[PDB]
Each structure stands twice: as structure tokens, then as C-alpha cells.
Amino acid sequence: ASNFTQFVLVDNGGTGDVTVAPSNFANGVAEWISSNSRSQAYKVTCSVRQSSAQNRKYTIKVEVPKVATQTVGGVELPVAAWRSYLNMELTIPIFATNSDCELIVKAMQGLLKDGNPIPSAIAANSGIYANFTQFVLVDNGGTGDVTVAPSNFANGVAEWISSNSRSQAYKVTCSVRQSSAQNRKYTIKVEVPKVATQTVGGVELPVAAWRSYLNMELTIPIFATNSDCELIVKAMQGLLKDGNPIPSAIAANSGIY
Amino acid sequence: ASNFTQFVLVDNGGTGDVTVAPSNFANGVAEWISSNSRSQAYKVTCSVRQSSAQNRKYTIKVEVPKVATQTVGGVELPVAAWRSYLNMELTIPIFATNSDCELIVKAMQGLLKDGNPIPSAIAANSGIYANFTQFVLVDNGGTGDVTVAPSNFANGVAEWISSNSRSQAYKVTCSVRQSSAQNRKYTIKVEVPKVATQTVGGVELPVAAWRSYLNMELTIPIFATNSDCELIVKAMQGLLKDGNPIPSAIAANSGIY
Amino acid sequence: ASNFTQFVLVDNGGTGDVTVAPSNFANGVAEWISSNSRSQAYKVTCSVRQSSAQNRKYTIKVEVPKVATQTVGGVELPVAAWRSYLNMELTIPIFATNSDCELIVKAMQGLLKDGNPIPSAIAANSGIYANFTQFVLVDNGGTGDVTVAPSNFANGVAEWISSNSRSQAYKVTCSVRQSSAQNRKYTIKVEVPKVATQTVGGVELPVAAWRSYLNMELTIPIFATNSDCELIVKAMQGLLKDGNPIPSAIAANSGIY
């Protein structure tokens, strides 16, 4: 309920906090503003939309403006010269118990943790970026964890499904390419499956609702570098961080308000 | 660091050692020469090239010239009548711990060991050659080993993924065919996955960077026989042998210099 | 009194010299040849040409041979088994004063000397040398540095960018590619910018007024052993250091004065 609390997007350390005021957006989505004007601040969207018939989506965008003086006037107009668009339509179950979403929430914070894969990849912007990595999607805590390795490499578009079948494990996809004369994209689809209401496979399973389709389109301009890209990552993880309104909504099978 | 040490390519036994002096090649690659002229010696390349966005490659070639008097002059011109081209663009992770590459290094020496599959196959040149075999890719030592059997046989182009999912195990491919009036090829792709920073699946996994695409194109001329082909194999294994500069580079996520 | 004459270039210890005498210029294309035998001579070019109305392009190719012996038909024919192709196209605008070119030359030749992170690739395994990271290059006295970090490789084309601003960054490329069945070609371009200020529209936009284009294509056959490339690199970079008869033209009035 009303998880609209002013949470810090980028946990830099206290200085220059990208603190974002909640409560906003029109026709079905969410928002979280930072302390500046309508051209240099950070955008943080999050909408709930019943994708199909048994699987509801979660469109969640997050902008990462480059805080630099505009080069089109020579005045003090605060605006970004380029932005790091972060899209992610995370599908999800609904009639399953509350602990099912916790499994998917950790499946988002664990995807971006301090000293982990993607977070330290897209952060250097080059000797590592774009996408395909590994991480225990569900960080349960010593027992019940989900391991997930890789295999195929067709046309440079990978697809990884966990320690189960090619039709019953935590799958994730992606791809990068120079779409035009200036930008690039990170189509990191993270189809997060659900496996809750269970101890360790103790029959009391009766789970419900099938999958999620976390399709992502992270456009990163060629004007970025190492430093500005670590900020892009901190925007992705500071998005789905425990206790924050973005993942907490996705935790109770609920929006925000 | 500077793994450029004179290592013996073919471990024949001391006589006629194909010892190769290191330190060479232009515009991004490596070399290791043998004691002769520029037409009968053995070539041993190895380049590092960031294939995509999160997966860096390892183009590694190795020539196997037939030490026979040239049949185009009747003089003492030392040159090969035919060569056994060995190509292998081995992709790989980078921001993962040093022990991740050890897993992939053994995944190359174990692929060619004394009294094993491929090494005793391509060696007889006929009742066994070309490709598709098995071997514990990662030779850990009694615990944590990776078993990997087979299944499909579509159009004669096999694909084998290990004891996991069709999207999360050690996969490898290949194929052979008479490309022209005189040569043949061994398109032995060995897509080596990574699974490090872990005991035996003890949660402390947090691994990173996805897969490798060790595409291979081993062209073997129809003028070869049993004896000259064992030398071709010893060139493949003496390439990725522990302690040698080729796999040692691939062991520390590094080149040579 | 005659300029463009027999000069000195690539050398090692005391045995064979490489005096490059003059030869042709037909239709605006300089050319230098060495000793008695042309089939073993060191070809080099140079031509002035204004590309449009605000620029001045150039073309300085270089073919480095090999003192081998092709015996075909019972005759020992002294011919090169391969040749280099160091072709540096450089565009210099009219607006760019006579104080930019001096620092451009030491940035093109002063980019690949005898092991720099870019040309060490042209002399050893790590054709990146460093798992491809932030390296050093062109410098002068103690004021501004040029740390060249990584950036892109899409479709097999390495690329390095420097500091904060891309419009003032030092781009550089590198890609492995086997041209046919008996050769190995490469491509290492280089764009050297200028820390100028284009004020158009009242804004001081930090952008380069021009960029260099040191593109060295090098073909190395499979027959050529791992002892030719070492002496090829010191012949391409070891051709234009910081005033050699060929690159002194790239730093002063002297074409070959």
C-alpha cells in the first residue's frame, strides 16, 4: 500500500543523492522526480498492465540524463545531451501467494548487485557492457537457490534457461546493435518464471499463473563513457531494490498509488 | 604475464621437437616459430578480440605443414605440400574470477588428452576422424566434474549440451564435408559455457559474463594419412596444454606480449 | 642538391641495410624503391590532395617485403612472399592553423612506435595487450593526458575512446580477418582530434575541427612463419617514428628533404 515514499535512486553515498519524490504519471503509470527542472532530472516510470489472459505485465522505465550544460544556446539551460533509456515490461502472476513475487523481486535485485555480473559490466561501458550474464535469480539464502548456466550462441543472440528443462526454468535473453547513426540498444529480455508455495519441492506446491516477459530496451548513446555508465547501472538496480516502491509493488502483486 | 616462453608444440619425446620461439605477429595476434625457414615451419597464432558486448573472443590458429621435399622444382626448397589449418575463435568471460578461465582451460586440454576421444580420432585419420566426441570438459578432479552425453542427429550436424538444460550446459557442435576438389573441413564449434565462483552449488555463485563461441574450421587435405594426422592432433592439444602460453593467457583472462 | 633521395629506414643490428632510393610519381603518387632487386624492395608512397574546400587529405602507403626465395621451376627467384600496406590518410582543414599538424604527426606515428598498446598488438599476442583497457599513447611535457579507454567492436571492428568528451576523444580501431586461403589481412585506423571550440549559435561546443585516419592494412600469409611479423611491425611503425625521411614529411616542409 501507498509505497510512494521518497527513495534514493542512485545510492552514491549521501552526496548528490538522486532522491526522487513519488506520486505521479498519467493514464496508468508511475513516477519519481528528482530535485531539478523538467530537462535534467531523472525519470522513473512503472505501470501495471494485464498483458494477456493469465499473465499481467509491468512496464517500467528509467531515464539517466547526463547532467551537463546544454550545447545549444550557451545559456544555463539544464538538460541532457543524451539519455540512457531503460525499458522493462515485466510480466507476472497474480493469484499466487505473496511469497511468489518475493522470488521475482529478488530476481531483480540479484540481477544487479554490488560486485556482481551486469552491474559491473554495463558499468565500465566497454570491456564488459551490453548483455548476457549469470546470477542466482532468486537469492533465497543457503537453500532453494536457482543455479543457471549457458549453452547456445546462434547469431549472437543468447538464451539461458536454468537447472531444469528448456521449457520450465528461469530463462533470459538479450542483444545489442547500432540501431542508427548515434545510439545503441540492450534488448535484455528477462522472462522470469515463478516457483513458489513450496519448501523444497514438498508436494504442497499448487502454484499458479505462468511466467513473466521482462522484455528490455536499454538505449545507450555512443557519447557515454565509464563514469556515466556506472550511474546507468545504479539506476537499474536502485530501481528494483528491496524496500523501494518499484519492487515492493511487484512484491505484493500490486501497483502503488 | 609475458607467457611468451619457448614451449614445445608437439610432445614427440625429445627427438625432432617442434619447439617454438614465442613473441610475434601483427595487428592483434600471436606467434610461435620453429627452427626452420619461412615455408616448412609451424605456425601458432592466438589473438584476443572483444567479440560483442559482454563476450570477448580468442582467435587461435595452428598450422601443421608436411615436412616433405617440394614437388615443384626438384631443388631443396623446404615447404609444405599441404597444410592442416586449425582455426578456433574461442569467446570467453572477463570480469569473472581467475578460476573461471581455469575451468575453460581444462575444457581445452581435456578436449585433447592422451588416450581420449578427439585425440585418438583425428589421429588415425580414417576409421575415426572429423567430429563429434565426448569428454568431461572440465577436469576438476573427483568432484564437480561435468558429464555430457548426446541425442540429436539432424542432417548429420550434431549438437551436444551437458547434464543441464538445452540452454544452460556445455554445448559443442561440428561438421565435415568435401568443400572442393582437394580439401575437407572440421567445423568443430565448441561453445564453452562458464560456471565458476562456486564450491558445489553453494550459493556463493555470483558468476558473470555469458559463454564462449569456439567456432573451429580445421581444413585437412586428402593427401594426409595416419601418421601425419597424429601430428595434427598433437598440434591441437600441444596448443591448449597447461603451462603453455596459449591456454595460460586464456587462463588469466589475458593475452601474452 | 636533390631532395626525395636514397634514405634510411628500418634496421637491426649490423647486417642488412634498407636504403630506399626514388622511382616514380606518375599522376601524383610518390614512390620509393630500395636496392638492386625490386622483388625485395621497400615500396612507399606519398601524395598531396585537397579533398574539398575546407580540408587537405593525403595518402602514404608502405609495402614491406621479405627476403625469401620462391623456387618454382628449379630456379631460386628472390621474391617477397608478402608485402605490407601502411596507408595513412590524413585530413587537415584550412582553418586548422600551422600548429595542429605538428601535434597530429606525433599522434599518428606517435601512436604506433615499437610496442605501444596499439602497435604492441602488431608485435605480439595481446593485440590489445591488456584485456583491452584504458591505456597511454600521445603525450608532451606535463599538461594534458590521452588515456584511451574501450568502447565498441560491433561486427568485428575494435574501437577506443578517451576521456569525458567524445568530440575530443582519440578513436582507434583493430580487426582480424583472413582475406583468402594464403593470407591474413588487418585494419587499424586512427582518428586524432583537436581540443578546439566550435562556437555556433552562441554556445562553446568542445569539438574537433578535424580527425586523423592512420589506417594500416597488413597482409600476412600462412606460409610466412612466426618470424616475419616481428620484423614487419618494426617496419611499418618502424617506418614513421618522429622524423624519418617518410614521416618527417608528416612533420615538416621536407617531403624527403
From Swiss-Prot, chains A, B, C:
Presence of the UniProt keyword Zinc in the record: no
Predominant cellular place of this UniProt entry's protein: virion
Region (Viral RNA-binding) location: 31-232
Transmembrane segments: none
Keyword flag RNA-binding: yes
Domain of life from the UniProt record: Viruses
Stored SUPFAM superfamilies: RNA bacteriophage capsid protein (SSF55405)
GO molecular function, one term: structural molecule activity
GO BP annotations listed: negative regulation of viral translation; regulation of translation
InterPro entries: Levivir_coat, Phage_RNA-type_capsid
Protein family according to the UniProt entry: Belongs to the Leviviricetes capsid protein family.
Role description: Capsid protein self-assembles to form an icosahedral capsid with a T=3 symmetry, about 26 nm in diameter, and consisting of 89 capsid proteins dimers (178 capsid proteins). Involved in viral genome encapsidation through the interaction between a capsid protein dimer and the multiple packaging signals present in the RNA genome. The capsid also contains 1 copy of the A2 maturation protein.
Subunit structure, as described in the record: Homodimer. The capsid proteins form dimers that assemble by group of 5. Twelve such pentamers are linked together with free dimers. The homodimers binds to the viral RNA via an operator hairpin, but also to many other RNA sequences in the viral genome; this interaction probably shifts the virus from the replicative to the assembly phase and ensures specific encapsidation of the viral genome.
The protein's name: Capsid protein
Source organism: Escherichia phage MS2
